[PDB]
Amino acid sequence: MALKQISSNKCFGGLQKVFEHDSVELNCKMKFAVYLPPKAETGKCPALYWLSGLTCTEQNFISKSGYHQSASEHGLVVIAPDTSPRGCNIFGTGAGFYVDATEDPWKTNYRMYSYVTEELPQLINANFPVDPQRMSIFGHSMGGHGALICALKNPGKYKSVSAFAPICNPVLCPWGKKAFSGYLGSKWKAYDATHLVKSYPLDILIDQGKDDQFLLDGQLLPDNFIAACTEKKIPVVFRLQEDYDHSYYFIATFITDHIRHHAKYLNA
Amino acid sequence: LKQISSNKCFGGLQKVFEHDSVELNCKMKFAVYLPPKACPALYWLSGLTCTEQNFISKSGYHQSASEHGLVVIAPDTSPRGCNIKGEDESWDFGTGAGFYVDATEDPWKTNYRMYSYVTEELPQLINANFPVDPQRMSIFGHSMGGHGALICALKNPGKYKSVSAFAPICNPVLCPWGKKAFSGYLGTDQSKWKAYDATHLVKSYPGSQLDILIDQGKDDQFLLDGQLLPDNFIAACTEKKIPVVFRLQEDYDHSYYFIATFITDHIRHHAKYLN
Ligand SMILES: [Ca+2]
Ligand SMILES: [Ca+2]
Ligand SMILES: [Ca+2]
Ligand SMILES: [Mg+2]
């Protein structure tokens, strides 16, 4: 399906683009960013999807993360969708946590789980030089939660997963309780990484800043997820990074490690 | 769990249980056979119109399940007793017709989650309540349940040791049954549909080789009607180098008389990989 190009800027040899399309899942125009590395000039590339957190559009990650150099060198197409069909209504985040909403009025339009896992990859594969068989996913905060649950709910669909400061056990934290209450109204555990990993039938990298206010506030609960991984013998690398916070300055510091991680499992 | 029935059969016990399903938000019945050994688990998925009674009473599976020491679990085919508008009308949609998908469309979203029931909730419940090895599980089924078995294995690489089917719906995106079910449960976004189609799934399946066994009656009315489309799936396997034994059985139909004839072969097939 048909795309409208919003912008294009050369960066580390490849092209950072932004596109708009008519989303079937979301019932609206939706924007997403696509980075086409040098590899995409001549061949199909593996794809890496980035999910952003609160207050983000597609612009934050593409302009502030510094992911381009490593994506260019390894030859990964990087896709960064917007976080939601509509602006924020905001004492809660007001965000929908990448679920398929079951409560009205969110019901009708907030179908971010299906958008990320089904509609968007179909669109990318039809429109860009991407290998449909090799896809990985990562993200930050609410998007870290998003990446984990997309991977864990769809075994083998993603070659690898990673996250920066993910919300690991949303059913137990205030942000998750408030979001799930609004969007899902018991349905909740199907969207909780700590629950999902316990019955998972594989390579996970997580970075967490130790001076992250939201970690200190108990929103993230990484130890619950790591413990669930350890019991299941799922190989997880969890790095607690001293004095780092929740910001894109933290993300930028470790993004190359993440791109290298995904490049390995995407056979790039 | 509430025990509904228990009957001794080839040394083991054929039981039926009732429970409150979290995924389906209703009371559900399922059958469990505990062989004398009770074990690896084998899940049987039934087709359109079936309850948890059809396979256990008509397949004659017990002798082979007993001899090979397999726990066999046979769930129902849809949520029950929900009184949802539109679910009771037609035999090919709604009750007895869950299609082993997680529905995304109202009014099916809340109760029609047979995919998550079969792959997540049920195995969790079985593991917690029965002497089952959580690491050794296989799946098979008939028609809509053949579709179910195939997609459950293909969407979950590493989860099942083996898979087989009787007269499976192999390419549901293309057949009338699949088109109706998917339109109703999943809506018009066919990207969703392809994620529940064995022929599409096998092309992208990244897991270890599965040795798939399929029996098909040649005089099967639904084969003739084009509901099943096995050749599309066989070709898809061939290209992905997934080993598949496809057996076209002369003069056999779609019934449990056909299933009963070949059930021992299937149990032995799964036993090879489970034991
Ligand atoms: Ca902070
Ligand atoms: Ca055994
Ligand atoms: Ca269903
Ligand atoms: Mg989570």
From Swiss-Prot, chain A:
Residues at the catalytic site: 141 (charge relay system), 212 (charge relay system), 246 (charge relay system)
Record key words, sorted: Acetylation, Cytoplasm, Cytoplasmic vesicle, Hydrolase, Serine esterase
Entry superkingdom: Eukaryota
Protein species of origin: Homo sapiens
Keyword Cytoplasm annotated: yes
Residues modified as N-acetylalanine: 2
Protein name: S-formylglutathione hydrolase
Keyword Magnesium: no
SUPFAM superfamilies for this protein: alpha/beta-Hydrolases
UniProt main location, coarse: cytoplasm
GO cellular component, one term: endoplasmic reticulum lumen
GO molecular function: carboxylic ester hydrolase activity; hydrolase activity, acting on ester bonds; identical protein binding; methylumbelliferyl-acetate deacetylase activity; S-formylglutathione hydrolase activity
Localisation: Cytoplasm; Cytoplasmic vesicle
Modified sites of kind N6-succinyllysine: 4
Coiled-coil blocks: none
GO BP annotations listed: formaldehyde catabolic process
Enzymatic reactions: S-formylglutathione + H2O = formate + glutathione + H(+); 4-methylumbelliferyl acetate + H2O = 4-methylumbelliferone + acetate + H(+)
Family: Belongs to the esterase D family.
